[PDB]
């Protein structure tokens, strides 16, 4: 259940992850298929840790949108023939005032398979 | 300057330490939780995320690899400054590991957290 | 998009909702596929509201679980010309300590289809 | 005691009134939110839920049908005994917005939480 490689999800988005070093880490690019203003979508980075020990490991990473102010974070698990990432996310928008915070965070799921 | 470099704590009593936030926003760090499913097990734990640098009240996100367990937590939120001090409004997801894909529906867990400097 | 009728979600679970009154309110039953103690699973009742005016109505409801201390609430929206409910959910558990609160809440989703 | 019947404020300003909690556990009530997307429109909105009866600190859930928007919120949580003897509520919630196409589903569920107090 190597997280390296090229994956796609059910909302059409695609990602690529670099090599995983043995202390958990990976780097990747994210191309989102869907967005708040898909007038402005580009390639966004992505930093994350993944257990290297259990064969169906938990994990988590961070996407940093280069086209807006928000952050999306993902956790989930890889299962086995074929590998499937079951994930969930929080998409945090930026609000101008802290008193506005309550409406900043959304949540959702996604399912990834290799390409 | 809302840089997450430094020491932060939160409402349940956890302390984290973030190092250098690099030019691309990235930062390693460590997190001592004051609370887990098996709190007897608690150890130190490594942490990796990215922040926005431009934004004056930056949005952020990081991943905690809990070594003392098979699971993971991701955190997102925003840094704010009206007392003049800096609060981190964040929400998180705990991912537990189930054995089979069938149990997937029961693995993800959610909550909030409020971090301030030490 | 009436919630009256016999739906079924993606995990295998089953529900039946009755008549929705003029102010959006409805009741029905929920036989679940899954649970944290499957040998316990029984018929549990539900209660929500559904915007009556919308052609693709938003709605929310609460399952009160017969066989245990805990509660799941759902929201979502109903799309079309076949009908489909997109829902996310929060499962709330009894902790016995409020210092233990941060862990009594869990999240997921469900797609619902008529039967 | 930890019954829902009563009036409750929350860490964010908003208030709520809950009616009689029947045998089947149900309850009815109203809710003025202190905050929303178009706060000019905020009115009293209805509420409907179910809470576990016998247990001393019950789980519960209820649906808030937003009278001014086309949106819905669900809250879940528990009634605890804060040591002072006073009942605080711990919840988390979803807020569902309406979207025009099923393809936009992914953007319509906000998550958050609150703390209610007796009023």
PDB file of N, CA and C in Angstrom, chain A residues 48-99:
ATOM      1  N   UNK A  48       2.490  15.336   3.524  1.00  0.00           N
ATOM      2  CA  UNK A  48       1.889  14.323   4.404  1.00  0.00           C
ATOM      3  C   UNK A  48       2.686  13.138   4.935  1.00  0.00           C
ATOM      4  N   UNK A  49       2.164  12.563   6.026  1.00  0.00           N
ATOM      5  CA  UNK A  49       2.746  11.405   6.691  1.00  0.00           C
ATOM      6  C   UNK A  49       1.841  10.184   6.539  1.00  0.00           C
ATOM      7  N   UNK A  50       2.451   9.021   6.417  1.00  0.00           N
ATOM      8  CA  UNK A  50       1.724   7.782   6.237  1.00  0.00           C
ATOM      9  C   UNK A  50       2.453   6.711   7.017  1.00  0.00           C
ATOM     10  N   UNK A  51       1.738   6.009   7.879  1.00  0.00           N
ATOM     11  CA  UNK A  51       2.336   4.852   8.546  1.00  0.00           C
ATOM     12  C   UNK A  51       3.032   3.970   7.528  1.00  0.00           C
ATOM     13  N   UNK A  52       4.139   3.356   7.937  1.00  0.00           N
ATOM     14  CA  UNK A  52       4.930   2.543   7.013  1.00  0.00           C
ATOM     15  C   UNK A  52       4.948   1.077   7.502  1.00  0.00           C
ATOM     16  N   UNK A  53       4.003   0.711   8.351  1.00  0.00           N
ATOM     17  CA  UNK A  53       4.179  -0.441   9.218  1.00  0.00           C
ATOM     18  C   UNK A  53       3.048  -1.482   9.120  1.00  0.00           C
ATOM     19  N   UNK A  54       1.799  -1.015   9.301  1.00  0.00           N
ATOM     20  CA  UNK A  54       0.590  -1.820   9.068  1.00  0.00           C
ATOM     21  C   UNK A  54       0.374  -1.861   7.569  1.00  0.00           C
ATOM     22  N   UNK A  55      -0.067  -3.008   7.057  1.00  0.00           N
ATOM     23  CA  UNK A  55      -0.135  -3.254   5.621  1.00  0.00           C
ATOM     24  C   UNK A  55      -1.291  -2.514   4.986  1.00  0.00           C
ATOM     25  N   UNK A  56      -2.253  -2.119   5.806  1.00  0.00           N
ATOM     26  CA  UNK A  56      -3.363  -1.297   5.346  1.00  0.00           C
ATOM     27  C   UNK A  56      -3.382  -0.004   6.176  1.00  0.00           C
ATOM     28  N   UNK A  57      -2.356   0.849   5.996  1.00  0.00           N
ATOM     29  CA  UNK A  57      -2.007   1.927   6.905  1.00  0.00           C
ATOM     30  C   UNK A  57      -2.951   3.118   6.875  1.00  0.00           C
ATOM     31  N   UNK A  58      -3.145   3.698   8.050  1.00  0.00           N
ATOM     32  CA  UNK A  58      -3.803   4.972   8.159  1.00  0.00           C
ATOM     33  C   UNK A  58      -2.867   6.014   7.529  1.00  0.00           C
ATOM     34  N   UNK A  59      -3.354   7.240   7.290  1.00  0.00           N
ATOM     35  CA  UNK A  59      -2.509   8.367   6.855  1.00  0.00           C
ATOM     36  C   UNK A  59      -3.236   9.713   6.889  1.00  0.00           C
ATOM     37  N   UNK A  60      -2.535  10.757   6.442  1.00  0.00           N
ATOM     38  CA  UNK A  60      -3.085  12.093   6.421  1.00  0.00           C
ATOM     39  C   UNK A  60      -2.164  13.027   5.665  1.00  0.00           C
ATOM     40  N   UNK A  61      -2.741  13.943   4.890  1.00  0.00           N
ATOM     41  CA  UNK A  61      -1.959  14.986   4.233  1.00  0.00           C
ATOM     42  C   UNK A  61      -2.697  16.321   4.146  1.00  0.00           C
ATOM     43  N   UNK A  62      -1.962  17.339   3.696  1.00  0.00           N
ATOM     44  CA  UNK A  62      -2.453  18.732   3.602  1.00  0.00           C
ATOM     45  C   UNK A  62      -2.272  19.208   2.182  1.00  0.00           C
ATOM     46  N   UNK A  63      -3.371  19.700   1.597  1.00  0.00           N
ATOM     47  CA  UNK A  63      -3.355  20.414   0.323  1.00  0.00           C
ATOM     48  C   UNK A  63      -3.402  21.929   0.569  1.00  0.00           C
ATOM     49  N   UNK A  64      -2.495  22.647  -0.093  1.00  0.00           N
ATOM     50  CA  UNK A  64      -2.436  24.099   0.017  1.00  0.00           C
ATOM     51  C   UNK A  64      -2.729  24.684  -1.325  1.00  0.00           C
ATOM     52  N   UNK A  65      -3.953  25.172  -1.429  1.00  0.00           N
ATOM     53  CA  UNK A  65      -4.471  25.794  -2.622  1.00  0.00           C
ATOM     54  C   UNK A  65      -3.716  27.030  -2.986  1.00  0.00           C
ATOM     55  N   UNK A  66      -3.188  27.020  -4.203  1.00  0.00           N
ATOM     56  CA  UNK A  66      -2.344  28.106  -4.671  1.00  0.00           C
ATOM     57  C   UNK A  66      -3.183  29.163  -5.351  1.00  0.00           C
ATOM     58  N   UNK A  67      -4.446  28.820  -5.557  1.00  0.00           N
ATOM     59  CA  UNK A  67      -5.375  29.722  -6.216  1.00  0.00           C
ATOM     60  C   UNK A  67      -6.378  30.364  -5.261  1.00  0.00           C
ATOM     61  N   UNK A  68      -6.256  30.138  -3.956  1.00  0.00           N
ATOM     62  CA  UNK A  68      -7.120  30.853  -3.031  1.00  0.00           C
ATOM     63  C   UNK A  68      -6.511  30.918  -1.650  1.00  0.00           C
ATOM     64  N   UNK A  69      -7.339  31.270  -0.673  1.00  0.00           N
ATOM     65  CA  UNK A  69      -6.919  31.337   0.716  1.00  0.00           C
ATOM     66  C   UNK A  69      -7.180  30.046   1.561  1.00  0.00           C
ATOM     67  N   UNK A  70      -7.867  29.054   1.012  1.00  0.00           N
ATOM     68  CA  UNK A  70      -8.278  27.940   1.860  1.00  0.00           C
ATOM     69  C   UNK A  70      -7.262  26.779   1.976  1.00  0.00           C
ATOM     70  N   UNK A  71      -7.426  25.953   3.000  1.00  0.00           N
ATOM     71  CA  UNK A  71      -6.671  24.716   3.127  1.00  0.00           C
ATOM     72  C   UNK A  71      -7.669  23.507   3.121  1.00  0.00           C
ATOM     73  N   UNK A  72      -7.275  22.428   2.452  1.00  0.00           N
ATOM     74  CA  UNK A  72      -7.999  21.190   2.579  1.00  0.00           C
ATOM     75  C   UNK A  72      -7.058  20.152   3.221  1.00  0.00           C
ATOM     76  N   UNK A  73      -7.508  19.484   4.270  1.00  0.00           N
ATOM     77  CA  UNK A  73      -6.733  18.364   4.827  1.00  0.00           C
ATOM     78  C   UNK A  73      -7.492  17.047   4.632  1.00  0.00           C
ATOM     79  N   UNK A  74      -6.750  15.956   4.410  1.00  0.00           N
ATOM     80  CA  UNK A  74      -7.292  14.571   4.262  1.00  0.00           C
ATOM     81  C   UNK A  74      -6.654  13.603   5.281  1.00  0.00           C
ATOM     82  N   UNK A  75      -7.460  12.715   5.896  1.00  0.00           N
ATOM     83  CA  UNK A  75      -7.027  11.428   6.529  1.00  0.00           C
ATOM     84  C   UNK A  75      -7.785  10.269   5.907  1.00  0.00           C
ATOM     85  N   UNK A  76      -7.358   9.048   6.190  1.00  0.00           N
ATOM     86  CA  UNK A  76      -8.017   7.893   5.614  1.00  0.00           C
ATOM     87  C   UNK A  76      -7.150   6.672   5.757  1.00  0.00           C
ATOM     88  N   UNK A  77      -7.507   5.611   5.014  1.00  0.00           N
ATOM     89  CA  UNK A  77      -6.826   4.319   5.042  1.00  0.00           C
ATOM     90  C   UNK A  77      -6.758   3.711   3.645  1.00  0.00           C
ATOM     91  N   UNK A  78      -5.686   2.978   3.376  1.00  0.00           N
ATOM     92  CA  UNK A  78      -5.527   2.246   2.139  1.00  0.00           C
ATOM     93  C   UNK A  78      -5.916   0.794   2.391  1.00  0.00           C
ATOM     94  N   UNK A  79      -6.750   0.189   1.552  1.00  0.00           N
ATOM     95  CA  UNK A  79      -7.059  -1.221   1.697  1.00  0.00           C
ATOM     96  C   UNK A  79      -6.664  -2.016   0.424  1.00  0.00           C
ATOM     97  N   UNK A  80      -6.517  -3.343   0.542  1.00  0.00           N
ATOM     98  CA  UNK A  80      -6.480  -4.197  -0.643  1.00  0.00           C
ATOM     99  C   UNK A  80      -7.883  -4.719  -0.958  1.00  0.00           C
ATOM    100  N   UNK A  81      -6.822  -8.215  -4.868  1.00  0.00           N
ATOM    101  CA  UNK A  81      -6.264  -7.375  -5.925  1.00  0.00           C
ATOM    102  C   UNK A  81      -6.038  -5.894  -5.569  1.00  0.00           C
ATOM    103  N   UNK A  82      -7.010  -5.025  -5.893  1.00  0.00           N
ATOM    104  CA  UNK A  82      -6.794  -3.558  -6.023  1.00  0.00           C
ATOM    105  C   UNK A  82      -6.795  -2.684  -4.736  1.00  0.00           C
ATOM    106  N   UNK A  83      -5.974  -1.628  -4.757  1.00  0.00           N
ATOM    107  CA  UNK A  83      -5.829  -0.657  -3.658  1.00  0.00           C
ATOM    108  C   UNK A  83      -6.827   0.507  -3.738  1.00  0.00           C
ATOM    109  N   UNK A  84      -7.447   0.823  -2.612  1.00  0.00           N
ATOM    110  CA  UNK A  84      -8.443   1.866  -2.576  1.00  0.00           C
ATOM    111  C   UNK A  84      -8.214   2.746  -1.353  1.00  0.00           C
ATOM    112  N   UNK A  85      -8.093   4.049  -1.563  1.00  0.00           N
ATOM    113  CA  UNK A  85      -8.004   4.962  -0.423  1.00  0.00           C
ATOM    114  C   UNK A  85      -9.392   5.480  -0.028  1.00  0.00           C
ATOM    115  N   UNK A  86      -9.860   5.082   1.150  1.00  0.00           N
ATOM    116  CA  UNK A  86     -11.061   5.671   1.716  1.00  0.00           C
ATOM    117  C   UNK A  86     -10.669   6.909   2.555  1.00  0.00           C
ATOM    118  N   UNK A  87     -11.076   8.101   2.134  1.00  0.00           N
ATOM    119  CA  UNK A  87     -10.682   9.305   2.856  1.00  0.00           C
ATOM    120  C   UNK A  87     -11.814  10.223   3.299  1.00  0.00           C
ATOM    121  N   UNK A  88     -11.452  11.166   4.157  1.00  0.00           N
ATOM    122  CA  UNK A  88     -12.391  12.179   4.529  1.00  0.00           C
ATOM    123  C   UNK A  88     -11.634  13.462   4.631  1.00  0.00           C
ATOM    124  N   UNK A  89     -12.321  14.587   4.481  1.00  0.00           N
ATOM    125  CA  UNK A  89     -11.588  15.842   4.462  1.00  0.00           C
ATOM    126  C   UNK A  89     -12.234  16.984   5.191  1.00  0.00           C
ATOM    127  N   UNK A  90     -11.416  17.977   5.529  1.00  0.00           N
ATOM    128  CA  UNK A  90     -11.947  19.267   5.946  1.00  0.00           C
ATOM    129  C   UNK A  90     -11.369  20.335   5.033  1.00  0.00           C
ATOM    130  N   UNK A  91     -12.267  21.138   4.471  1.00  0.00           N
ATOM    131  CA  UNK A  91     -11.888  22.253   3.636  1.00  0.00           C
ATOM    132  C   UNK A  91     -12.150  23.483   4.457  1.00  0.00           C
ATOM    133  N   UNK A  92     -11.087  24.213   4.823  1.00  0.00           N
ATOM    134  CA  UNK A  92     -11.207  25.379   5.676  1.00  0.00           C
ATOM    135  C   UNK A  92     -11.113  26.604   4.826  1.00  0.00           C
ATOM    136  N   UNK A  93     -12.147  27.429   4.796  1.00  0.00           N
ATOM    137  CA  UNK A  93     -12.006  28.731   4.174  1.00  0.00           C
ATOM    138  C   UNK A  93     -11.427  29.730   5.136  1.00  0.00           C
ATOM    139  N   UNK A  94     -11.020  30.878   4.582  1.00  0.00           N
ATOM    140  CA  UNK A  94     -10.655  32.047   5.398  1.00  0.00           C
ATOM    141  C   UNK A  94     -11.815  33.005   5.554  1.00  0.00           C
ATOM    142  N   UNK A  95     -12.017  33.442   6.783  1.00  0.00           N
ATOM    143  CA  UNK A  95     -13.026  34.444   7.074  1.00  0.00           C
ATOM    144  C   UNK A  95     -12.295  35.675   7.606  1.00  0.00           C
ATOM    145  N   UNK A  96     -12.877  36.842   7.404  1.00  0.00           N
ATOM    146  CA  UNK A  96     -12.208  38.049   7.829  1.00  0.00           C
ATOM    147  C   UNK A  96     -12.126  38.210   9.336  1.00  0.00           C
ATOM    148  N   UNK A  97     -13.220  37.941  10.028  1.00  0.00           N
ATOM    149  CA  UNK A  97     -13.240  38.077  11.479  1.00  0.00           C
ATOM    150  C   UNK A  97     -13.411  36.730  12.208  1.00  0.00           C
ATOM    151  N   UNK A  98     -12.763  36.592  13.369  1.00  0.00           N
ATOM    152  CA  UNK A  98     -12.895  35.382  14.191  1.00  0.00           C
ATOM    153  C   UNK A  98     -14.363  35.095  14.543  1.00  0.00           C
ATOM    154  N   UNK A  99     -15.122  36.135  14.869  1.00  0.00           N
ATOM    155  CA  UNK A  99     -16.556  35.977  15.095  1.00  0.00           C
ATOM    156  C   UNK A  99     -17.267  35.351  13.904  1.00  0.00           C
TER     157      UNK A  99
END
